[PDB]
Specification:
2 copies of one chain form a homodimer. The first copy, chain A, has one domain. Chain A is α+β, with helices and mostly antiparallel strands. The first copy, chain A, is globular and about 35 Å long. In chain A, a hairpin with a 5-residue loop joins β2 and β3. Chain A has a 3-stranded antiparallel β-sheet. Chain A has 3 helices and 3 strands. β2 of chain A pairs antiparallel with β1 of chain B. Chain A: Organizes the germ plasm and directs localization of the posterior determinant nanos. Oskar protein is required to keep nanos (nos) RNA and staufen protein at the posterior pole. Chain A: Interacts with smaug (smg).
Chain lengths: ~80, ~70
């Protein structure tokens, strides 16, 4: 249970997403940006893709070079 | 992919035929069930495996529905 020592993980990750909404972000970037944002190393060591995709309005996919990319879904109106 | 050699082929097929409208995990599992005649090997972290398949996209919807697709 890593939610005990890092309870705000949800809003912190959504925050990084929101900051990267335009172009999307990789995993290693999510981590470095998490460190920059909170002063603490990204706590999640297992199943990060699953964690990312537990968050609504998120899409993921790979570039041709094999980078797994996450981004917010465009709004529909 | 290791123990199950043809898993790649089978999941690629389930995608090709049944994912045209997007496909959830459990749909992949029941489709695999109706395909190979046996329960889908993976339980946890299927999203990771799916994403390792070329030309596949994942999405968590506004309402929290996890759906997989082929790009175009």
């Amino acid at each position: 249970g890593s939610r005990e020592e890092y309870p705000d993980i949800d809003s912190e990750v959504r925050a990084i997403l929101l900051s990267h909404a335009q172009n999307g972000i990789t995993i290693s970037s999510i981590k470095s940006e998490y460190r920059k944002l909170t002063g603490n190393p990204f706590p999640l060591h297992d199943n990060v893709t699953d964690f990312m995709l537990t968050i609504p309005n998120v899409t993921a996919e790979c570039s041709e070079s094999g980078k797994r990319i996450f981004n917010l879904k465009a709004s529909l109106k």
